[PDB]
């Protein structure tokens, strides 16, 4: 918004203090312009041609132009500000050929007053345009005041106001006396120009020699005084007495009435006005040409011995002309547009070498092979070739005036040796010292290559050409042009599909003849319309035109099959025969120079994927013998869900066209076939091509790997968002809404969904069935901001516009962060969705300014609230009275503040339903007083997590905590308890003690060897640092833990209980199944990891995944043996910490540690190894890197 104005001060003022220098007598030369307005960076959306003719000038740095009238630097050329117009707001033959085609109709207004008022006639029915307006119109009525009509038709033309509002001196002192009138714009040495033998005349830069009469052009600021007069006047007699024929050799290495009147007749005929016509406005038929009304391309000039020589321009063709030359491109398109460009603009004469070219000859040889020369085709497709002058005498008029004859030969690819004078002219090209051109495609450049000096390639510059054509021809609609240019940086490979600039007429009909793209502008509509043009152009039946479509479609199946793009030309079992149909169709071509077996090339590599999409609907809604087993075959070769987002986004979004739906349930069944997988990560990351958002696709892998890095359910939640999103677009656009609906209900269930409804018209078909999701989620970390970027590549808008009366809306989820305000509009959105949903899940994360938000939130809401998380609040009284007065609360977690809630506590002991607490860092000996108010209420409790700073009253705790029937996970920790008898009573008088967290309370564990035998079905046990000797706790906890084979997660602390406890305990935990987590912190000296070594050799361990050997005494080659077998033979483990021995543990024998990295790489199913508290080097970085890349199933090595 403002950052373009402040940044406009930044780079515009930084450039304003930089490059003010302007030599406003120098910058008028054309050749230095189109030379240096060609080969610069060119990343904008603006044509360099008429910006070199805008009145400004620029070098080639980032777009900073200057001028002579308004001298200011201007850069950052962006949309819709035409720089010829922005020049204003920031401050003979054409008229002759015009009225030549003058019809009979328009004579209520005279044509000569149209001649005296600046009008140009375009050779159609009575339509005009000015030389610098661009609008050809008819609509002729009576009283049309012509220049005032030009100010009254349309206000587009600012050329309206921009235009409306010697014989006695034959000595070098008298010649030099004429040279003392020297023009300022020439910094060339004047004295050498005096000694060059000229004298001045009186105009700009022409100059008149006295010996022969040399005057001529190419006079600029950095030229040579002698060179042009030598190499372009080699017969000046004073120069002959100055530099003779042996001295013009370095400049040589630097650079009849029937014949004449024949040249006058053919010169009068080759300036044809109706020759302009092209079917580039084919059915659109817009009143306009293709040079003054269309932009251009450039030349990839390539040398014959493989350097890519230059990228010349169209006047740079004229500078060093080629006596015989070939160009590659597209027939119908640019190449014949280049030839008819040469002839039609050769009927204009603006370039300073024009009007002196003699005889061009346009020819298209695709029609003929007529075994007869000039009179056949000049008398056939043109007017005539003369009868008094013979056809060989016409060829004698060629071979008598050869040096300025220019040829425009087309399509030797459809030509053999059958025309006589033609093919013998081409094979004997010396015998006419002429300029020959030819426009053969890249299938048959080899037959021309014997007669070539350099090759020329036509190439589109889709930076600016597509927005010039769609600018000028579609100024009627410019907001979709804004959609195009904003789409150019949302999709930065938009140049990767615009590959031919004169087959954008399908886009032209897809704006003026198909208005659907104006509200549906993404890619597949556009090149779907291009494919529809490929059905319209060469309209035919089910020939191998159509089997060229399908057969090159399975060439595209080989294209994305093994990711092969530039082919081998071996397997032509897909397409094969009649190459003229495939190159005439132009879906492919082949290699130019030598290969061993030559190489096929495409017009567009990503366009090939759209060909494979045509192949996929061909293999989706057609004969079901084995064809859809081929589409099913490759469609099952792509079966990994993390690859599905990007690869199925681009390619399956190409499949999102072609709505036929005869096996769309099979491909959305492949979308349901994607289940919870891990190897999909490097299934995508191993692949090579990524299509449009290519380094961004690398970033998609990085961020989704970051999603699985933290949260497995948020990663799969984003997977659910993209799978349900693209499956929703494909489902609604495929119209399989009642055909696949309960299968989509299988595609919904169990997945937790964050609320995204702005593609609501795809979703609102039947939301009641589409309503049984597992969860609903809103938050306010950076994930939802990236999702804002993802649609950017609302809630109640799509949600109530979705359903006017929602029904039975499921439960909800809230996260809030510390940067949240209290805007009431989103609180009204919360009023709507809380009025809709069942109940709320609610998470407070440091949210200040939420007291002023929780007052209107609970004010608007009613008493239906389940979960509240109280992460680091302010703990004020009024908002917890307002939270307090709502019944049916079920969940409240309180673990943060040293400040203790009192009214919320003792008044939280009133209601019913509550099952979640927490009491971390509070401190209470006496706060338990109205807790016996809760004691009649709730036998419904599912989370208990207590901390006190000292001893509380325990009789109430043993009483009603004894009165619990529905035990659960417990978190208990950290006070001066000193009472194992009350806790022995309550833990001895209960039933369901199967998830116990007793991490580090001051306590004597004599109870646990009594109450652990009372309950056998325990699954999770956590303990932090206690007293733990090696015969009392080792024998008694060897029995008590020995009879406890139901456990899954084990956290044992901090004892001098020594390796006998590893014998019996590592024995029994070795010999129990259903076990996942295991932790031996502050214990396991090296003989105890001998016990995990010899124990871990035999097995019985294959269920385990998580394991911690933090805090050994010393790991060394001992640990290489023990972690060799123990980190070898156990193919399910994934967790390891070796750390916090912090000062100096490089006593590990580092190369044997590299062998231990070989040993960890033996383990397939590992994820996180933590190799902390020793030095690495460069070497083991390369070692754990390279052996990490052996199987990439792991990702978490932590230094």
């Amino acid at each position: 918004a403002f950052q373009v104005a402040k940044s406009q001060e930044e780079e515009e003022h930084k450039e304003r203090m930089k490059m003010k220098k302007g030599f406003n007598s120098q910058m008028r030369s054309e050749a230095k312009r189109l030379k240096t307005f060609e080969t610069y960076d060119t990343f904008r959306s603006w044509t360099p041609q008429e910006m070199a003719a805008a009145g400004f000038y620029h070098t080639g740095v980032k777009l900073g132009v200057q001028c002579f009238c308004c001298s200011l630097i201007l850069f950052g050329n962006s949309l819709r500000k035409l720089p010829i117009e922005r020049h204003k707001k920031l401050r003979e033959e054409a008229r002759l050929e015009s009225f030549e085609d003058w019809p009979f109709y328009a004579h209520g207004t005279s044509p000569r007053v149209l001649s005296a008022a600046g009008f140009v006639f375009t050779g159609k029915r009575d339509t005009v345009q000015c030389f610098s307006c661009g609008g050809s119109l008819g609509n002729w009525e009576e009283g049309d005041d012509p220049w005032k009509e030009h100010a009254k038709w349309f206000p587009k033309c600012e050329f309206l106001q921009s235009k409306k509002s010697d014989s006695v001196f034959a000595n070098e002192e008298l010649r030099m006396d004429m040279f003392k009138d020297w023009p300022q714009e020439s910094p060339v040495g004047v004295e050498a120009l005096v000694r060059a033998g000229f004298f001045y005349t009186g105009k700009k830069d022409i100059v008149r020699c006295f010996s022969c009469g040399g005057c001529l052009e190419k006079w600029a600021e950095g030229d040579d005084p002698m060179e042009d007069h030598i190499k372009f006047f080699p017969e000046c007699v004073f120069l002959q007495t100055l530099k003779s024929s042996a001295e013009v050799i370095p400049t040589l290495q630097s650079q009849f009435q029937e014949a004449r009147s024949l040249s006058e007749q053919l010169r009068d005929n080759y300036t044809k006005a109706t020759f302009r016509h092209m079917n580039l406005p084919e059915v659109c038929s817009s009143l306009g040409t293709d040079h003054l009304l269309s932009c251009d391309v450039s030349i990839i000039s390539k040398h014959i011995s493989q350097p890519v020589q230059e990228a010349l321009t169209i006047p740079e063709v004229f500078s060093n002309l080629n006596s015989v030359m070939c160009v590659e491109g597209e027939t119908g398109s640019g190449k014949t547009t280049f030839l008819k460009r040469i002839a039609f603009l050769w009927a204009s004469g603006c370039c300073p070498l024009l009007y002196r070219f003699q005889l061009v000859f346009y020819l298209s040889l695709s029609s003929i092979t007529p075994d007869q020369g000039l009179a056949n085709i000049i008398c056939a497709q043109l007017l005539g070739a003369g009868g008094c002058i013979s056809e060989v005498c016409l060829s004698s008029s060629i071979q008598q005036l050869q040096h300025q004859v220019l040829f425009l030969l087309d399509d030797y690819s459809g030509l053999a040796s059958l025309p006589q004078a033609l093919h013998t002219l081409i094979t004997k090209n010396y015998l006419s010292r002429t300029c020959l051109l030819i426009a053969v495609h890249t299938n048959r450049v080899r037959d021309i290559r014997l007669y070539l000096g350099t090759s020329l390639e036509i190439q589109e510059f889709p930076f600016y050409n597509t927005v010039s054509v769609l600018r000028k021809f579609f100024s009627h609609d410019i907001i979709c042009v804004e959609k195009l240019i904003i789409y150019f940086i949302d999709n930065k490979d938009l140049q990767g599909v615009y590959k031919t600039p004169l087959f954008v007429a399908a886009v032209c009909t897809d704006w003026i003849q198909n208005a659907s793209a104006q509200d549906k502008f993404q890619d597949v509509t556009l090149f779907q319309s291009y494919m529809q043009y490929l059905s319209l152009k060469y309209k035919a039946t089910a020939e191998p035109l159509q089997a060229t479509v399908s057969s090159c479609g399975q060439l595209a199946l080989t294209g994305l099959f093994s990711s092969c793009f530039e082919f081998n030309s071996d397997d032509l079992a897909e397409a094969g025969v009649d190459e003229d149909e495939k190159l005439t169709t132009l879906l492919m071509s082949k290699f130019t120079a030598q290969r061993l077996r030559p190489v096929y090339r495409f017009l567009g590599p990503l366009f090939q994927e759209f060909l494979a999409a045509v192949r996929l609907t061909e293999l989706l809604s057609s004969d079901r013998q084995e064809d859809q087993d081929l589409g099913l075959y490759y469609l099952r070769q792509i079966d990994s869900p993390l690859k599905a987002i990007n690869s199925f986004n681009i390619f399956l979004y190409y499949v999102s066209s072609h709505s036929s739906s005869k096996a769309a349930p099979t491909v959305v069944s492949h979308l349901l076939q994607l289940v919870d997988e891990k190897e999909s990560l490097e299934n995508m990351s191993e692949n090579e091509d990524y299509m449009k958002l290519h380094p961004q696709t690398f970033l998609w892998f990085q961020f989704v790997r970051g999603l699985w890095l933290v949260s497995p359910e948020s990663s799969s939640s984003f997977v659910s968002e993209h799978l349900l999103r693209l499956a929703l677009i494909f489902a609604y656009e495929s119209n399989t809404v009642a055909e696949c609906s309960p299968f989509i209900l299988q595609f919904l269930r169990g997945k937790t969904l964050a609320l995204r409804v702005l593609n609501l018209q795809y979703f609102r078909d039947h939301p009641e069935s589409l309503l049984l999701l597992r969860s609903l989620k809103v938050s306010i970390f950076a994930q939802d901001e990236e999702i804002i970027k993802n649609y950017e590549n609302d809630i109640s808008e799509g949600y109530w516009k979705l359903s006017p009366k929602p029904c039975k809306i499921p439960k909800l989820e809230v996260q809030v962060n510390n940067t949240d305000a209290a805007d009431q509009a989103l609180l009204q959105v919360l009023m709507e969705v809380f009025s809709a949903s069942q109940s709320i899940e609610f998470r407070l994360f440091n949210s200040s300014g939420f007291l002023e938000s929780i007052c209107p939130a609970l004010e608007l809401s009613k008493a239906s609230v389940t979960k509240c998380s109280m992460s680091r609040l302010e703990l004020s009284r009024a908002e917890q009275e307002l939270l307090l007065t709502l019944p049916a609360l079920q969940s409240l977690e309180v673990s943060e503040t040293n400040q203790l809630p009192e009214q919320l506590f003792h008044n939280l002991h009133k209601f019913l339903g509550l099952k979640e607490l927490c009491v971390r860092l509070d401190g209470k000996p006496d706060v338990l007083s109205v807790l016996p108010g809760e004691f009649p209420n709730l036998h419904h409790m599912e989370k208990l997590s207590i901390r006190t700073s000292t001893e509380s009253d325990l009789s109430k705790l043993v009483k009603f905590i004894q009165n619990f029937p529905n035990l659960h996970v417990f978190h208990l920790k950290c006070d001066f308890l000193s009472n194992c008898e009350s806790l022995m009573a309550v833990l001895a008088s209960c039933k369901k003690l199967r998830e116990i967290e007793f991490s580090g309370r001051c306590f004597e564990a004599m109870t646990f060897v009594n109450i652990l035998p009372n309950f056998v079905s325990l699954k999770i046990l956590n303990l932090k640092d206690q007293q733990f000797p090696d015969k009392e706790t080792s024998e008694k906890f060897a029995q008590a833990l020995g009879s406890l084979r139901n456990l899954e997660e084990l956290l044992v602390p901090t004892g001098d209980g020594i390796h006998q406890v590893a014998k019996l305990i590592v024995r029994q935990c070795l010999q129990l199944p259903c076990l996942r987590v295991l932790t031996f912190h502050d214990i396991l000296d090296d003989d105890s990891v001998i016990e995990i070594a010899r124990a871990a050799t035999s097995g019985g361990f294959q269920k385990l995944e998580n394991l911690d050997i933090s805090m050994n005494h010393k790991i060394t080659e001992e640990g290489y043996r023990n972690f060799f077998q123990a980190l070898d033979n156990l193919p399910n483990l994934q967790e390891l910490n070796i750390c916090r021995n912090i000062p100096g543990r490089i006593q590990v024998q580092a190369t044997t540690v590299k062998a231990l990295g070989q040993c960890v790489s033996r383990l397939p199913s590992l994820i996180r190894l933590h190799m902390l508290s020793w030095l690495l080097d460069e070497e083991d970085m390369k070692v754990i890197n390279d052996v990490k890349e052996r199987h990439p199933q792991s990702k978490r090595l932590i230094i």
């Binding site: 918004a1 403002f2 950052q3 373009v4 940044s7 959306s45 950052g76 962006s78 949309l79 819709r80 500000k81 804004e482 240019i485 904003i486 150019f488 940086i489 380094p695 961004q696 970033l699 990085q702 961020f703 790997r705 970051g706 999603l707 890095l709 933290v710 970390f781 950076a782 901001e785 990236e786 804002i788 970027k789 950017e792 910490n1137 750390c1139 916090r1140 933590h1170 902390l1172 978490r1196 932590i1198």
Partner: protein, 68 residues
């Protein structure tokens, strides 16, 4: 005058706060002289600053691409 700009540069203000998350990377290199928190912040928030880095010069590409 495109008006896809105002809350998008309050969003770019937040993206400059991901530049302040670049200063949180400077905090992490400042804080050298368990660590799964630093693992998920450096790797995950580095991926977020990459997404909003191409998507922070990407609205700079908007302003350097829209005609004003």
């Amino acid at each position: 005058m495109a008006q896809v700009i105002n809350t998008n540069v309050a969003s770019l203000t937040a993206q400059r706060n991901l530049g302040v998350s670049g200063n949180m990377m400077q905090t992490s290199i400042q804080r050298l002289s368990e660590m799964a928190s630093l693992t998920k912040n450096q790797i995950l928030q580095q991926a977020g600053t990459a997404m909003l880095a191409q998507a922070n010069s990407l609205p700079q590409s908007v302003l350097s691409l829209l005609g004003r």
